Design a protein around this motif. Structure first.
Motif, PDB file in Angstrom:
ATOM      1  N   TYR A  69       0.860  -1.171   0.000  1.00 47.54           N
ATOM      2  CA  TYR A  69       0.000   0.000   0.000  1.00 47.54           C
ATOM      3  C   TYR A  69       0.903   1.230   0.000  1.00 47.54           C
ATOM      4  O   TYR A  69       1.825   1.317   0.806  1.00 47.54           O
ATOM      5  N   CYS A  70       0.628   2.182  -0.885  1.00 51.75           N
ATOM      6  CA  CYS A  70       1.244   3.495  -0.932  1.00 51.75           C
ATOM      7  C   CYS A  70       0.142   4.529  -0.796  1.00 51.75           C
ATOM      8  O   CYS A  70      -1.021   4.255  -1.104  1.00 51.75           O
ATOM      9  N   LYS A  71       0.527   5.685  -0.272  1.00 52.21           N
ATOM     10  CA  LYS A  71      -0.333   6.788   0.132  1.00 52.21           C
ATOM     11  C   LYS A  71       0.164   8.059  -0.553  1.00 52.21           C
ATOM     12  O   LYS A  71       1.376   8.254  -0.664  1.00 52.21           O
ATOM     13  N   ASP A  72      -0.769   8.895  -1.027  1.00 53.81           N
ATOM     14  CA  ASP A  72      -0.528  10.068  -1.856  1.00 53.81           C
ATOM     15  C   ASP A  72       0.181   9.673  -3.160  1.00 53.81           C
ATOM     16  O   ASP A  72       0.952  10.447  -3.724  1.00 53.81           O
ATOM     17  N   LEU A  73      -0.078   8.467  -3.670  1.00 53.85           N
ATOM     18  CA  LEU A  73       0.449   8.044  -4.954  1.00 53.85           C
ATOM     19  C   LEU A  73      -0.294   8.845  -6.030  1.00 53.85           C
ATOM     20  O   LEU A  73      -1.526   8.806  -6.039  1.00 53.85           O
ATOM     21  N   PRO A  74       0.398   9.594  -6.907  1.00 50.69           N
ATOM     22  CA  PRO A  74      -0.254  10.408  -7.922  1.00 50.69           C
ATOM     23  C   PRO A  74      -1.008   9.511  -8.903  1.00 50.69           C
ATOM     24  O   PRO A  74      -0.528   8.433  -9.255  1.00 50.69           O
TER      25      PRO A  74
END
Length: 64
Positions: A47-52
């Motif tokens: 999981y990544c967060k603020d991924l464009p």
């Protein structure tokens, strides 16, 4: 910017040996931060967060 199960090419998750690996990769992409649901949703994903939005998400289907 969104949350995403981040993928490589195509719809396949990276080798999250340690949660840190994914947070690292995620931030390398210029996102906020990430973490790995091992015992969680998707089951051993990154999981990544603020991924464009430019970068796609791991859709609940195939991996090529």
């Amino acid at each position: 910017v969104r949350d995403a199960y981040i993928a490589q090419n195509y719809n396949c998750v990276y080798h999250c040996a340690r949660d840190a690996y994914c947070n690292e990769l995620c931030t390398k992409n210029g996102a906020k931060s990430g973490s790995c649901p091992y015992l969680g949703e998707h089951k051993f994903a990154c999981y990544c967060k603020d991924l464009p939005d430019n970068v796609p998400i791991r859709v609940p289907g195939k991996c090529h």
